[PDB]
Amino acid sequence: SVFVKNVGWATQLTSGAVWVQFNDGSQLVMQAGVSSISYTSPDGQTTRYGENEKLPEYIKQKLQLLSSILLMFSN
């Protein structure tokens, strides 16, 4: 049967790339992006930002807390 063997990703602020290697030796490399961000402030107010809207700095700084690189392999 076919199953995932190794997976990895590298993300930035609103986009990222994912890699996957299957047991048959094949591989997929994909690039992805955020189309909308709905931010709910601690005060309960919600604001939506479309892909073509500039993001205020405080949202960018929180997005940066999410940026990461991950590599996982079956052992």
Site for a copy of itself in 4-33 (CB under 8 A): 4, 7, 14, 18, 20, 22, 24-33
Dist. CA 29–CA 11, nearest whole Å: 13
Residue 75 CB, shortest distance to a copy of itself, in Å, is: 19
Q: Rounded to whole angstroms, how far apart are CA atoms 75 and 73?
A: 6
Least distance (Å) between residue 61 CB and a copy of itself = 8
Q: Which of 38, 52, 54, 73 binds a copy of itself (CB under 8 A)?
A: 38
What is the C-alpha to C-alpha distance for residues 23 and 46, in angstroms, rounded to an integer?
A: 44
